[model samples]
Target chain A: MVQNDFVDSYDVTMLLQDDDGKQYYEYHKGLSLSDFEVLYGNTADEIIKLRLDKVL
Target chain B: MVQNDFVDSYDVTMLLQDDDGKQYYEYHKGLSLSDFEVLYGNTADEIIKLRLDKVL
Candidate 1:
């Protein structure tokens, strides 16, 4: 049997393309923090910091 | 902190339904090859060969 390994942690954000290439960002909302915690077992503060890092 | 390893190579092809269930086939076009190369960091020949494996 082929077991499906599905990750439900991420939500689709904007699809981006640049000279480098294409990538998609996770959608930002209050729920994202909660979902991230569930997926990564991380503190909300840490998650917020990481998100800021991506933005910067 | 939560981080996502997102994949960007794949393209949405035709939504397919079969006697068994639902699936999708990647559409073949010249542009699709270019897109796959950009996403996978693979050569066009390698990508094309991989595509054939999936098709057959």
Candidate 2:
């Protein structure tokens, strides 16, 4: 259930494990919307569609 | 230190490690204030008190 929420401009890799002890990994690139969707599911699409603040 | 800063509408789990090699995990939901406070420290109260942008 561990999820990565940081949005990066480069390909970011995260180690994930499920309740049954299954391990999984995913990589994401911020340039492409489809890539984000694949990594973060539908919520990523919603986030990408928004006009974000530049404040860090 | 690495931290998760996203506000979401679901219970998300994250793997965290401290400098002393102790591993900690946390889960948070966007609905209940108490749930988020336990997972995210007292920062949620500050964020909630402020008027945040809904854009992204």
Candidate 3:
């Protein structure tokens, strides 16, 4: 993808956990939270309500 | 750069403004806030204190 450095963009990996303690990570490159939610069917509210931290 | 989709990383573009109202953007690929600060001299506290919103 062609990226304009002047524009604000993010490559994000979101953490989602399923029942039974199984964890899943969703990767998003240069996308928004809405796009991330739509692609994964996770609600924006849910994501917002969840914790956000710098993942090492 | 080789990317591991499994790990949590971000390609982020940060906005900075000059005293003259000129805006500058800093681009970061797969970096931490500490690295970002060291590279640009922008403090983490300053970044965290700044307003953050999804830039359309």
Candidate 4:
């Protein structure tokens, strides 16, 4: 298929944002959720709704 | 300076892609959005505008 050719990420990479635009960290993709829990502390299951109307 | 609330994270983490259908990974903003990127990777900022026409 036309698409199947593209996304086949055999070895993909990740780009994380800068903390507070100052502090920073390097990371990767394809790491398991279980290992991530041990590494990043816990499995993240948080949802943050952006109420842009109230952002002002 | 500016009024930024819970957006502040003393520690923020990220997750990555899964290789094939085997190895699993975790991510914010839907670790699965990776699917869309691969499917829709042919995008703008050098994007192919045909995708918008799909909705029509």
- Top model by DockQ, which number? 3
Per-residue lDDT tens digits for candidate 3, residues B1-56, read 33454235434455544566665555555544345335434432222111111111
Residue A54 of model 3: what lDDT? 22
Candidate 1 share of real interface contacts: 0.00
Q: After aligning candidate 3 to the native by TM-score, how far in Å is the CA of B3 from where it should be?
A: 31
Which wins on lDDT, candidate 2 or candidate 3?
3
Off by over 4 Å in 2: A1-26, A29-44, A47-56, B1-8, B31-56
lDDT of 1 by residue, B4-49 (tens): 2212323322223344554434443323333543532432121111
Q: What ranges in model 3 sit over 4 Å off?
A: A2-8, A33-56, B1-56
Q: Mind giving the per-residue lDDT tens digits that candidate 4 earns over B1-56? A: 23253233221122222435343222222223333344333322221111101010
Considering only chain B, report the TM-score of model 3: 0.39
- How do these models rank on DockQ, best leading? 3, 2, 4, 1
The lDDT for every candidate, in the order shown, is: 0.28, 0.35, 0.39, 0.25
Error of 4 at B27 (Å): 15
Q: Of 1 and 4, which scores higher on lDDT?
A: 1
DockQ of candidate 1 (2 decimals): 0.02
Best prediction by TM-score: 3
> Candidate 2, residues A1-56: lDDT per residue as tens digits?
13244344433343345556554544443433234334444433222111111112
TM-score of each: 0.21, 0.26, 0.29, 0.22
Candidate 4: which stretches are off by over 4 Å? A1-21, A42-56, B1-56
How well is each residue in A1-56 modelled by candidate 1, as lDDT tens digits? 11232232223222222445443334432234335335333221211111211110
